[PDB]
Amino acid sequence: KILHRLLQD
Amino acid sequence: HKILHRLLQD
Amino acid sequence: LALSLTADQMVSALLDAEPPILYSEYDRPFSEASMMGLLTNLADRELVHMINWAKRVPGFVDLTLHDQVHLLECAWLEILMIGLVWRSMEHPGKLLFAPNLLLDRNQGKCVEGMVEIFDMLLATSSRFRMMNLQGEEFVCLKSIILLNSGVYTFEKDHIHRVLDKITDTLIHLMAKAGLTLQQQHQRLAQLLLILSHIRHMSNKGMEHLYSMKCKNVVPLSDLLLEMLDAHR
Amino acid sequence: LALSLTADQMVSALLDAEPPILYSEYDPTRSEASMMGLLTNLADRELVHMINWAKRVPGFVDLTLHDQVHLLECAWLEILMIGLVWRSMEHPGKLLFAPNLLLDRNQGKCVEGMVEIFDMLLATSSRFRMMNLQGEEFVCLKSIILLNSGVYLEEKDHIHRVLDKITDTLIHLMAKAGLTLQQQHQRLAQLLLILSHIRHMSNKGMEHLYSMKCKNVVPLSDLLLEMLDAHRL
Ligand SMILES: Oc1ccc(-c2nc3ccc(O)cn3c2I)cc1
Ligand SMILES: Oc1ccc(-c2nc3ccc(O)cn3c2I)cc1
């Protein structure tokens, strides 16, 4: 999930 | 020519 | 003739306009075709009462015939659904389509693509319950849906004037119940934000209903087909 | 953290968190593939900024990571659309997707099924202009969408606490604008009823987008797919 990692940064 | 037309006017 | 009405007179007029609660066929575990059959049959009969309910909604008769048609075509599934949700408020975990038709959640899986819609409806019902939604508030919300949902899809000034009237009516109710000024607009907000989700559910229901048509699971009435054809 | 925030501090935080206005790769020359290409390209780049905006929306970071994903997966097109509608306010009869990409109803016909969505977007923009929507109100509505559209387990209680906080903020704004108590509630209602239509447009847009993905018209970024698959059409 790109959104997951993108919210993780 | 709508069925909804008829229901609304009677 | 709707703008010159007091808040209590608006509540009473709406309460008096409430459609009846209809029954389903009283009889065997459901298949996909049968469960869709009952639902569409129920909705088809409810639609007839909805039109006469709509005409009794203050300000709705003041609109042109075309406008009336447009608002109903746009909002009919929303209206059926908020009624369903309201009826199911005293039955947690279940959906009260009709007094002789109580469906939990597992029965939603009889029809493909339906269980997701059941969950949204049950969530709305659980939300109403949490807020302790009053009948007076409910009839305001349902009529708001009728007048609002199609108004940006077109006389428009009149509809917004009636919408404002219902807003004052809602506030009036909350002021009666003892809610402070802050609590009044907070609750007003909470209630109107549910309609965004009711809209969402209708759109999912519309596509799902259209899906049952394409797969020809159950034959649909001409009226239902016409309400259906008014959408994408 | 977000609960102990004043109305003016709430507006300030939201205003300061606003995403940039991105440009399109549009070069003026004479399709359905190109027009759809420009739009999906722009949304993909905007989505990155939306995430960082979302994290700056008071109360959002307090939620679990799973719930953050759910709220964005549900509301991303709603949020993009209200942004579009807001940018287009001063441009009647036209949609400002980007400062270099200003399209009218006629150009929407270049993509099939798109002119219907265009018309709805235009009416919303016209409705905003009619109400003279203020930026301070726009940022409140947009953050409401983020928090409201997916919330329907003490997570829900926190979201509703923030939503109530934003509601108080809106009322605070209207009181400063000189509106009476009656005018305050009425406008609040009018603004929140728009969100229903924005939900509708998003529902229709999502299906249209899914239709363009299966028809293999223009391709979609991996981010757009995951946002699209989240709605399961
Ligand atoms: O009172 C009613 C009657 C029918 C519905 C209803 N809900 C659905 C969902 C999917 C579908 O295909 C048809 N549906 C119907 I008819 C709701 C409330
Ligand atoms: O800021 C933006 C960017 C893109 C859109 C947008 N609107 C549509 C409509 C239909 C469709 O298939 C895709 N769309 C997109 I991507 C809106 C605002």
What would your notes on this structure say?
- The PDB classes it as transcription.
- Keywords: Nuclear receptor, transcription factor, ligand binding, protein-ligand complex.
- The assembly is tetrameric.
- Crystal Structure of the ER-alpha Ligand-binding Domain (Y537S) in Complex with the imidazopyridine derivative 2-(4-hydroxyphenyl)-3-iodanyl-imidazo[1,2-a]pyridin-6-ol.
- Chains A, B: ncoa2.
- The organism of A, B is Homo sapiens.
- The complex is a heterotetramer, with 2 copies of chain A and 2 copies of chain C.
- Chain A has one helix spanning 2-6.
- Chain A is 56% helix and 0% strand.
- Chain A has 9 residues and is mainly α.
- Helix content of chain C is 66%, strand content 3%.
- Chain C has 232 residues and is mainly α.
- Chain C has one domain (1-232): Retinoid X Receptor (Orthogonal Bundle), CATH 1.10.565.
- Chain C has 8 helices and 2 strands; from the N terminus they run αααββααααα.
- Chain C is globular.
- The longest helix of chain C is centred in the last third of the chain and has 34 residues, at 181-214.
- In chain C, strand 1 and strand 2 (101-103) form a beta hairpin.
- Chain C has helices at 7-17, 32-56, 65-87, 115-131, 135-148, 156-176, 181-214, 222-229; strands spanning 95-98, 101-103.
- Chain C has a two-stranded antiparallel sheet with strand order 1-2.
- The relative contact order of chain C is 0.15.
- Chains in contact: A-D, B-C, C-D.
- Chains C and D meet through helix 4, helix 6 and helix 7 of C and helix 4, helix 6 and helix 7 of D.
- Bound molecules: 2-(4-hydroxyphenyl)-3-iodanyl-imidazo[1,2-a]pyridin-6-ol (2 copies).
- One 2-(4-hydroxyphenyl)-3-iodanyl-imidazo[1,2-a]pyridin-6-ol is lined by residues 39-40, 42-43, 46, 80-81, 83-84, 97, 114, 117, 205, 208-209, 212 of chain D.
- One 2-(4-hydroxyphenyl)-3-iodanyl-imidazo[1,2-a]pyridin-6-ol binds at residues 39-40, 42-43, 46, 80-81, 83-84, 97, 114, 117, 205, 208-209, 212 of chain D.
